[PDB]
Amino acid sequence: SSKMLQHIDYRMRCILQDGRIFIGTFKAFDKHMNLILCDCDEFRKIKPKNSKQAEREEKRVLGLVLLRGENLVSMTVEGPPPKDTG
Amino acid sequence: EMTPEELQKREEEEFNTGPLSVLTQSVKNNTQVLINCRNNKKLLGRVKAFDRHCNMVLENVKEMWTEVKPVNKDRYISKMFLRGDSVIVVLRNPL
Amino acid sequence: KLVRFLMKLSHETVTIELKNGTQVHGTITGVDVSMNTHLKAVKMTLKNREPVQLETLSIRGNNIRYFILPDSLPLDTLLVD
Amino acid sequence: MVQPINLIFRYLQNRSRIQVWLYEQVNMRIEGCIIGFDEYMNLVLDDAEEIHSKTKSRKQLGRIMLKGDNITLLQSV
Amino acid sequence: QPMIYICGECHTENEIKSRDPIRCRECGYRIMYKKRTKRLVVFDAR
Amino acid sequence: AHPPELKKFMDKKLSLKLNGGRHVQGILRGFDPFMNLVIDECVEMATSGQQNNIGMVVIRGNSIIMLEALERV
Amino acid sequence: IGVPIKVLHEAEGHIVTCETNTGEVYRGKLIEAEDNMNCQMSNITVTYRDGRVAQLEQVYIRGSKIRFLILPDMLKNAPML
Amino acid sequence: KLPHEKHHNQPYCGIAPYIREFEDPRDAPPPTRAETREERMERKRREKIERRQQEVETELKMWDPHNDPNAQGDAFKTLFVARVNYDTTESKLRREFEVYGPIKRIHMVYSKRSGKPRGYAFIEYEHERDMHSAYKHADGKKIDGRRVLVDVERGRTVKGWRPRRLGGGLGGTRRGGADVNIRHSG
RNA sequence: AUACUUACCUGGCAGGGGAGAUACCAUGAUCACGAAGGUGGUUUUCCCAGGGCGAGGCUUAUCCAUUGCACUCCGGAUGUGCUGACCCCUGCGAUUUCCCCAAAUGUGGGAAACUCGACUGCAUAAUUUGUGGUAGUGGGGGACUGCGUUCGCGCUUUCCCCUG
Ligand SMILES: [Zn+2]
16 A cells, blocks of 8 residues: 555645645545644635635644544645755 | 355345346346436436445446526536445436 | 456546546546545646646545546456456 | 433333434424334334424324434424 | 373274273274383383 | 543533534433433524423434533533 | 544643534643544634634534544654654 | 535436436347356356266166176165275175175175276175164274275165266265365265 | 462454466265266466566766767766566465474475464444535626615626636
8 A cells, every 4th residue: 555655744735525725744644544734724715706806815824633534535745745954 | 234254145135136126137138227416417328337335337328417597518428437425316217 | 346446447547526526637546445546647627726737646435426437448348356 | 321222212112202303404303103213213103293493384294214314303292 | 181092903093081981983993002101211222 | 332431421511512503402311332412401492592491302423513511510 | 543543642631623524613622532533622712614702611522523633733743753 | 615504506406307218119239238257157067067967867778777787686685885995805895894794795896997996895795684783883984994884785775866977875075165074974 | 380160350253366277186976987066286378466586778967988981779887767578476574383405503395373463355335434414506797676775785686798
């Protein structure tokens, strides 16, 4: 099951069933797909009801988060992991 | 289950004489079937295989739905894989 | 079972629709017993959103609505097991 | 220590008119005399009445069954 | 406890218990022999 | 099949939240591994301010969302 | 057991936040944690979907009905990680 | 929004206005019903079984069990012993089966083409009572280290009796795996 | 230090890639020479299901040498990321006993034994993740109604357009 092990510690963006996007460092998982994100930030797309305006984004910092697999839709790589080298 | 042995064929008799026999007989006679899914859309097509999870393998399917005046929209998919949980109703050709 | 057949579709291209109206077109690389599939070089299209190309995507099986497989798939030969 | 199974058995023996709420639906409720129940919480009624808060109309159904997953709350009389 | 005896006819090993009627379970033959002891035995080669 | 550690809330007045924006309030008497709770002196607590007491009732854990103890245990 | 479950057991006793499927978010001290994700909290601050808040003293929540949890960032330093 | 507060502007509708299936006479293709490595095997099992059954009828019609030159003496007197070690000398079988009574004749069957010992013989005692006395005791005897069973030969006594090759016989030393214990004897 | 009787405290079952072809071994098949099949091996083709051998080949920099007259690709070595035919085991990290080859305390082979792993199947689609009450069912620009109004707006009723 290297498909998930190879991706450990990478900066993944989880797609929620409600349409939210939780971008954080994927630390570990399990058979149920319950993920652990570090320094996670929540984004959500709000429809514009006033006029033809750019989609409104409401960011939200969370820190350490534990996402339930049942509530997890998908996940993709936003970028490489935080490089520790100068 | 009532038959905890590993040699149990309960799923077998279930698909042969139980309510799920509609799909077995459907694949046998190669008859069409219309399915109403949780997408508010209906999928009309044939079946080739299935299991206990009600996951069927369709071909020559035609998706159809309506939005809103109410306007209808339809398309075609020659091969697809439908899930069971999202299914609402199934209807074989009443002919 | 049949998930084994789903796991046999590696390296082929399909288009999956999700329960939220999202469409995802890409090549399959691995599947689990829980129906979770990993697609590489994939393009996702969320509802009322713009398409986006992702190099990888691991999707869960619960939020999957249905798949769209190629036209030349050998069903009679692939359903023997 | 009284358990839900024993309480349901008591209501069954008493033949009291038990009302049941629906899952994800607040406006409609059902009431009837329970006849039996399984571990899945499915309940059977002899004479059921579907009552709505907005309409207040009691639709007669008769001997029926209701799924346990749809149950939300039980109420006596 | 085990008390392995060698049957005369089939030369087969078999357990026998006390009060057990003497008969090879294998061939019904009524003559058996005790197996050679395990005690240490030495012989000066004189 | 480990049951929940609800011994603290035993014989305490709670207020439970349900799925469909519904709320109830009663004293707990017993639970089960499936979160099947049995509360007595229960009030319906409908959307309006009106109150209706029926007493002994049963609630399905699949529909029980949250339980708060008004008596702080 | 699962690694997230273990991270929760060690997260027992600290201030954590929990969001449920109904949208409500509760932030407060954690008292008891279980393998089935059932969480008990004390002196929490609730935020409803509309935005209104309330005050509670002792609360218990079912695990299957939780969307996600927020734990202290310091837990990343656990020995297993 | 929440599932309960979501305003369903177009909830799930029925399918009554969406019945546009194909006519009845437009039947499905008959030849599109088959599977590989599932039916050809049953076909081969059926042919080999019928072929054997027909060879069985031909053998029954050609060969007569009762009219056998090798078989001699009274059927109720003759005895049948099998699972006998191939090294058992004729004298060894005499010394083991004369104990129950004097033996008028002894017959060791041999392979017609290979000449090897079959492993079973027919013993004809002078008196029917000596045979019956041997029926209970002989079964389970050990000759030359290998257990042997003994039962009255039913080939010319029991109505409708035939050997393995003809579908009959007893003993399941080669029946379904893990279904017939080897310790149990006839 | 051993066994026996009682109380108390701990614990989820089955297994060992799979589908064909096997003329040959075992089962030495209970009826006058016989089964087939099946079971446990050996032989033989595959989806290649994981690994070992890295020959050959692809991409690009570093070092050395070459002033070279070719028109059938090609100077030698190092580094980064790939592929890879043929040939081997049908797959175990650890432990125990018997026999044998042996450079004889090691290095290995032929046998099982029941012990932990979260490798799979069923309790796993019947409330707690692996089979849904999270459906996706819209938004915006012009004309086009009404109620309240702070004239920004909340609800509400129509047609044409861009967007998904
Ligand atoms: Zn003996």
